[PDB]
């Protein structure tokens, strides 16, 4: 039911401290499976998921090769950027690049991604049509023009519909019981008095996958945004995710508030009340 594979690239220049640091990670949906760090004691593509370890040496050698090539080219892009924005070589700068493909249920390509930022701001991104590019500024227009000149969008499109999908399906089959799972969130409501006239209601959602989830509070059956605090979805450290949503309530109205939780692993959405 719609899956995704994405690669994340981060190159940071560090003047005086040698070559720029290169860190790239691979994800299937919300599960990391590979990792390459130029500052590792023996830089190479490493497995971070149990279901990818079964790949033979050829896979790790090829992956290491591609990762290293990406590192070199990124290092060249740093310099090219210094020249574009007319910046000093004594300052630190960062290039980030995410790309990947979305496997639709019909087995065909659903979505394509190839976007990159410089110093935390959009630089250049592949458009939804997977044929044209969008440049964020003047400097990126050079990259856009020269990428159009050598038909890169098409070349990346060949990968999107080729190796990307094939290997995505492969990963999906090999890690079926962990990637194609829908673990529902363990939920409960807690009560934390703020004073004598108020109290915080906290709705918990623990150990669910994937990270996609929805938590809302309602007063008398009507959604409430006032006096609510929803924290950013956080990882469990074991491959799961957590999230809680709190609401400040007048003492005595606790039973008029309900928590609503929507998740893929839930047969039907949950309506929770504080059970002392």
């Amino acid at each position: 039911g719609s899956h995704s594979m994405k690669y994340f690239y981060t190159s940071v220049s560090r003047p005086g401290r040698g070559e720029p640091r290169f860190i790239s990670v691979g994800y299937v949906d919300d599960t990391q499976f590979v990792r390459f760090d130029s500052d590792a004691e023996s830089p190479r593509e490493e497995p971070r998921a149990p279901w990818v370890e079964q790949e033979g040496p050829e896979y790790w050698e090829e992956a290491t090769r591609r990762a290293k090539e990406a590192a070199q080219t990124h290092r060249e892009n740093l310099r090219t950027a210094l020249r574009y924005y007319n910046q000093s070589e004594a300052g630190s700068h960062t290039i980030q690049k995410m790309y990947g493909c979305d496997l639709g249920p019909d087995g065909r390509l659903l979505r394509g991604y190839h976007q990159s930022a410089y110093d935390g701001k959009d630089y250049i991104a592949l458009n939804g049509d997977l044929r044209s590019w969008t440049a964020a500024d003047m400097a990126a227009q050079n990259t856009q023009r020269k990428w159009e000149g050598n038909r890169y969008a098409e070349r990346f499109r060949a990968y999107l519909e080729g190796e990307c999908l094939e290997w995505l399906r492969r990963y999906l089959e090999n890690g079926k019981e962990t990637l194609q799972r829908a673990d529902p969130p363990k939920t409960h409501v807690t009560h934390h008095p703020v004073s004598d006239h108020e109290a915080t209601l906290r709705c918990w959602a623990l150990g669910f996958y994937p990270a996609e989830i929805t938590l809302t509070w309602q007063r008398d059956g009507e959604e409430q945004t006032q006096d609510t605090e929803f924290v950013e979805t956080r990882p469990g450290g074991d491959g799961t995710f957590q999230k809680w949503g709190a609401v400040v309530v007048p003492s005595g109205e606790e039973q008029r508030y309900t928590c609503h939780v929507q998740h893929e692993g839930l047969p039907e959405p949950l309506t929770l009340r504080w059970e002392p």
Binding site: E69, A70, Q72, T73, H74, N77, A81, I124, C164, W167
Partner: peptide, 9 residues
């Protein structure tokens, strides 16, 4: 699997 070619800016 990673993308073979890397585009230069």
């Amino acid at each position: 699997i990673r993308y073979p070619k890397t585009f230069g800016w």
